[PDB]
Structure 1
C-alpha cells in the first residue's frame, strides 16, 4: 500500500472493543493520538456502545460537537479520539466522570469516579532525557512531555499528573511491594503487588506479580503499570479489584447471583 491506511475493518478491530460481526463492515479507525490503535478506546465506542448515550455514530457526532465531552480536562470533538489507560472522561452536562481502567477480562470498564478524583491521573514514565541547555524532560504513556521532573523519577515509575496544570504532584517508584496493574498480555487487567523482577539484558525483563488472593503471574516489564505505593492504590479500582477468577468461581458467583435475584 502507498501511504497510510485510513480504514479499520470490523473484524480486524481490537477484540476488547466488543463489537459485533453484523453491524457493518467497518469499525471506527481511531485517530492518531496519545494512545496506540490497539490499546485505546475511541470516543464513539465509549459514547455509543458502552454508555448507550447514542444509538448511531451521528448521535455521537452531535454529542461531541456540542462540546460536552472532556478528555483529561480538555474538550475533544473528535469522535474517533483514542482514549486509553488512566484517562479521564468528564461529562459535565450529566455531571459524571469516568476513568479508563481495564477489567480482569482485559476490557476497558465503565468505571465512574468522583469529581474530585477526576482532577488527576497516573502516568507511567516511558523515558527521561536531558535536552537543550540541560533541561530534563520526561515522556509518559500519554505521549505528554513534562519539563523539569523530579531527579528521582526514572523510567517505569508512575507520576500523578494534575490535569488542570499538567504538572507532576507525586510519584511512585518501580520497586517490589508496590501495587501494579497489568496493561497488556494474557494477564491484562490484573492488579497485584510486585514480588520480583528478572533482568534480561538485551531482551525483555520479566516482572512477577502476586495477587491480593495469593495468585501469582508474570508479565513483561512494559506491561506493568505501578498503580499505588505499597498495597494501597492511588486510584479507585473497578468492581473486581484486579482478581481474575477462574471460570469455575465465576460460574459459582453467577449461580449465587441467580439464586439471590431469580
Structure 2
C-alpha cells in the first residue's frame, strides 16, 4: 500500500549528484521537507561526512549538529537532513570557515570556501509577483522567502541580493540580453555565459540561449536560467574553472600534463 506520504528513500533511487556508494546499506537520508526541492537539495548529513569528512557515522553528525555549531543562512539548524541548496551559505563558527553551495561544472555541488566578508548576502531568483490585501505588493523567491514591499521594477526571472539578518533586498539584476547567467537544470548544469537570446513560444517552455567565454553556445529552458551578474562580472565568487565545461579530450590532456597523481 500507499495511502499516505512516504518517508523512506532507497539508496539506488536517491539522486545521482549526491555521489553515494552502493554497498553501505539499502537506504539514503531522505531530505526532510523544506524550501528546496527533493532532487535539488543536499541534506546537511551528506555535507559533513561524505564531503568534509568531519564526522564518520550518522550519530557523529547528530552530535555535531546538536551542539549548535552549524548555521544555514545565519539561523542555527539542528535537523541533520535539512535540505540545503543552491545559494545557501553554511557557516561553522567553531572553526571560522564558510561555504557557498554552487554547482561544479560536471553538474554537482562541491565545497567552495568564501571570505567571511562575503557570507553576509545571498542571491535569490524571483518566482512570483502579487498584490496582497490592502494593495501591498509581495515577492516569492526560489527558496520560498516572501518579501513585502519590493521596488516596483523587480519582475519575474530577475535576481535580487538580500541580507541574511534582515531580508530586505539590496540590489537586483534584471533578466535581459547581455547579462551573465548560470544554468541550473538538465544537460547544461553549472555552465556560465551571457544570455544573448530568448525565444518565446506562447504557452510552452520558452527557450533561452547562452554563450561561454570560448564561443561555445548552448540553449536551455528559461525556467533553468539563473542570472548571477550584471554583465561579464559575476557578483558572487566562482569555483575553479568557472563553468567552462571542457570536453574529455581536454580533460585527459590536463590530467596528463599536470600529472596529478600525488601531492
The two structures have a TM-score, normalised by structure 1, of 0.98
> Deviation per CA, 1:164-222, whole angstroms, max 9, x where unpaired?
11110000000111111111110011111101001111000111010112111011111
Shift of the alpha carbon at 1:109? Answer: 1.1
Unaligned runs of 5+ in 2: none
**Runs of 4+ with >3 A deviation:** 259-262
Q: Point out the structure with the larger strand share.
A: 1
CA RMSD of superposed structures (Å): 1.1
Counterparts of 1:51 and 1:128, CA distance in 2: 39
Counterparts of 2:5 and 2:241, CA distance in 1: 39
Find the residue that maps to 1:160 and give its secondary structure: strand
Q: 1:102 maps to what in 2?
A: 103
Find the residue that maps to 1:168 and give its secondary structure: strand
Shift of the alpha carbon at 1:128? Answer: 0.9
Shift of the alpha carbon at 1:82? Answer: 0.3
Shift of the alpha carbon at 1:240? Answer: 1.6
Go from structure 1 to structure 2 and tell me whether the alpha carbon gap of 1:22 and 1:36 turns closer, same or farther (over 3 Å shift).
same
> Deviation per CA, 1:134-168, whole angstroms, max 9, x where unpaired?
11110000111000111110000000010111110
Find the residue that maps to 1:155 and give its secondary structure: coil
Find the residue that maps to 2:105 and give its secondary structure: coil
Go from structure 1 to structure 2 and tell me whether the alpha carbon gap of 1:242 and 1:164 turns closer, same or farther (over 3 Å shift).
same
Find the residue that maps to 1:111 and give its secondary structure: coil
Find the residue that maps to 1:133 and give its secondary structure: helix
Counterparts of 1:212 and 1:237, CA distance in 2: 14
> Deviation per CA, 1:30-59, whole angstroms, max 9, x where unpaired?
011110000000000001101111111111
Counterparts of 1:49 and 1:184, CA distance in 2: 23
Go from structure 1 to structure 2 and tell me whether the alpha carbon gap of 1:129 and 1:259 turns closer, same or farther (over 3 Å shift).
closer
Go from structure 1 to structure 2 and tell me whether the alpha carbon gap of 1:259 and 1:181 turns closer, same or farther (over 3 Å shift).
closer
- Number of matched pairs: 262
Q: Point out the structure with the larger helix share.
A: 1
The two structures have a TM-score, normalised by structure 2, of 0.98
